[PDB]
TrEMBL record:
Gene3D superfamilies hit by this protein: Cytochrome P450 (1.10.630.10)
Keywords: Heme, Iron, Metal-binding, Monooxygenase, Oxidoreductase
Ribonucleoprotein in keyword set: no
Gene Ontology MF annotations: heme binding; iron ion binding; monooxygenase activity; oxidoreductase activity, acting on paired donors, with incorporation or reduction of molecular oxygen
CDD domains for this protein: CYP199A2-like
InterPro entries hit by this protein: Cyt_P450 (IPR001128), Cyt_P450_B (IPR002397), Cyt_P450_CS (IPR017972), Cyt_P450_sf (IPR036396)
Protein name as catalogued: Cytochrome P450
Family statement: Belongs to the cytochrome P450 family.
Binding site for heme b: 89, 93, 284, 340, 342
Cofactor(s) required, per the database record: heme
Any Pfam family hit: p450
Amino acid sequence: TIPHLAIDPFSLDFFDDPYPDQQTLRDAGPVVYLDKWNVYGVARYAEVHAVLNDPTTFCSSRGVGLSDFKKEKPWRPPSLILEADPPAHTRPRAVLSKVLSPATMKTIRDGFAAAADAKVDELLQRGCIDAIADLAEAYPLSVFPDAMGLKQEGREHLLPYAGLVANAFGPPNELRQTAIERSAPHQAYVNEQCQRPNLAPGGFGACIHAFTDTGEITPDEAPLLVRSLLSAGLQETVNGIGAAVYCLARFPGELQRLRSDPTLARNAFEEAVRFESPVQTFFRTTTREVELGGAVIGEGEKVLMFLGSANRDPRRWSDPDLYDITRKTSGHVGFGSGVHMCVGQLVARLEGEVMLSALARKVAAIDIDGPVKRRFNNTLRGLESLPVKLTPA
Ligand code: HEM
Ligand SMILES: CSc1ccc(C(=O)O)cc1
């Protein structure tokens, strides 16, 4: 009944151009079986959205990677939020939500915007830049570690650790094996940065430890929570910003619309998140036998959600492969959906907005003038190098 496909969604060939294979997965049926890894797959928006919003049946506590924690040991202690189900998920989720709250954005918005403006002014003095290293990477590195309260030393560990964590959600392929092999120095920096004496007062990390007397998290749970904010977000935001710059360069009519109305910057970044979906995939594990798209999925089965494919499903989006900064982006699953929907989404949107805002007000043209290189990761899609020439406004 269920179609069996041999597509490996974690192969380098798939990463190099996922979009044709994503259509094949969608059109094969609402639910597919991936013989390569013995997991079910859902690639349409309807089934992806439904799975994400049923956390009891499609749980996260048995891991959101390929590995089933009931069968294998997690490669690191489980995240108290990403790899937890309600009700254990609820109160730690509440703390991170309040730590990355609307009122917190109000405190950091001015500095994030001023740093974004200064960075763009700096790159314009140079003209020809790498939009990844010099912009998409440089800006989030210039604001997010400081907002976290991290020391100045050791920040070179942040992006390698983030990519390690992301690769480890994948199947036991070479990308995952080589990741976990290299984890040793990075996890030790992360170790020490999650401890309260090591986080600057006022930052995200200190605010997590200050929440340890409310009854929502204990003091011994705070280091793992700080780890969450060191294991997620930075690379995605970098990838999402680099995606927006790339799209503004390839869809030049959209930059002209952005220049003429800079208040489109927030939706311009949201549409970049939908268009590229920095987080391509996540797994769930069925806790019971369940019917999904006329399919019967047994207990203890891994279900692979193609978020990027759901964000390009023509059953849900008009012209899904086009970057449109005035598209109604509401409902895209680039940040997930339901109880686990990205708790850091306001931080990512703020960083993305003020960068695209600085570009909208200061840049006239963005022209690719060099070879574009892609970075491969079991979970994340993003560019490694994007040589562009920035023309000032
Ligand atoms: C473009 C930027 C980002 C993208 C595309 C993204 C993607 C996602 C997705 C899809 C999820 C859902 C995981 C699931 O349902 O299993 C998630 C959760 C999460 N994200 Fe983000 N994220 C981004 C930025 C950030 C930032 C900036 C932070 C931290 C400051 C962050 C921290 C987290 C955490 C801690 C979770 C776990 C939430 C939970 O399990 O309840 N992410 N992210
Ligand atoms: C790449 S999405 C993500 C990764 C790690 C965590 C965590 O460590 O809790 C949460 C979300």
